[PDB]
Amino acid sequence: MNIFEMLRIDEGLRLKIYKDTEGYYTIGIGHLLTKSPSLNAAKSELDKAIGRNTNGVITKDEAEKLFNQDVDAAVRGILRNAKLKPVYDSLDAVRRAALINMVFQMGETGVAGFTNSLRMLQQKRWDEAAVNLAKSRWYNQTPNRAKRVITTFRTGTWDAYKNL
Numbered sequence: 503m504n505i506f507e508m509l510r511i512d513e514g515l516r517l518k519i520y521k522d523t524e525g526y527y528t529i530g531i532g533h534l535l536t537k538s539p540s541l542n543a544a545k546s547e548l549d550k551a552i553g554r555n556t557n558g559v560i561t562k563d564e565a566e567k568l569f570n571q572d573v574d575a576a577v578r579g580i581l582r583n584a585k586l587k588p589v590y591d592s593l594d595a596v597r598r599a600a601l602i603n604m605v606f607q608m609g610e611t612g613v614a615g616f617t618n619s620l621r622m623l624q625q626k627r628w629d630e631a632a633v634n635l636a637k638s639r640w641y642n643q644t645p646n647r648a649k650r651v652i653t654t655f656r657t658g659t660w661d662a663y664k665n666l
Contacts, residue, residue, distance in 0.1 A: 503660040505573060505599045509606055511666050512647050515565060519544055519558045523644055529558075530565035532606070533572060576602050579610040586610065589620050597623070600654040607647075608640065623655060632656040 513532030519541070522528045527535045527544035535547045545558050552564055560568075580586045580601065590601055601623075604613045614620075616638070622631035632652050635641065641648040653662040 503663055505602050506569070508599055508660075508663055509573070509603055510569075511663055512603065512607075512650070515562070517560055517562065517565060519548065529560060529568075531569040531572075533565070533568045572606065573602070576605045576610075580605055583610050583614055585614040585617075585620065589624050592624050592626075594658055596658045596660060597655055600651050603651050603654075604640075607644075628656045628658075 510531055515531050516529060519527055519529050519535065522532070522534065526537050527541065527547075529535060529548060533551075535544045535551075538544065541558075545556070548556050548558060548560070551568060552560060580590050586601070586605070590598055593601065601613070616635070619631050619634045622628075622634055632655060635652050635655065636648070638648075641652070650662040654660070
């Protein structure tokens, strides 16, 4: 298991524009197109990302390319973030994958706002962090995903992803 497989599990793969859990236009493997309510704006953003007139449909290869770019960006965002970097550097490989997942889902800004959890993770207080992470809108809105990620931080193993 790795970050790619992990997020491929969490995000799924859709080759036609769709609405995510928050009702935002997305495509591929959780690639957010826009927060705008306009499907046109979304089709526009898609063509611009893909480089061609897509008509709101992409191929698997195009989806996977967006995905690689998105993972890359997430990592890069963490490394550049003063609040995230030190956390990320302190973690083992499995847990780092769990931080990337959060960043991918909620953005660097979003995650950097979990100050208390971040601090606990940095201190390696797993159970404590897990409890604090759960007191969040994130967990109440996407409880099953949140649980998988939280378990990953708690255990440092991929057990929550084994079986899927």
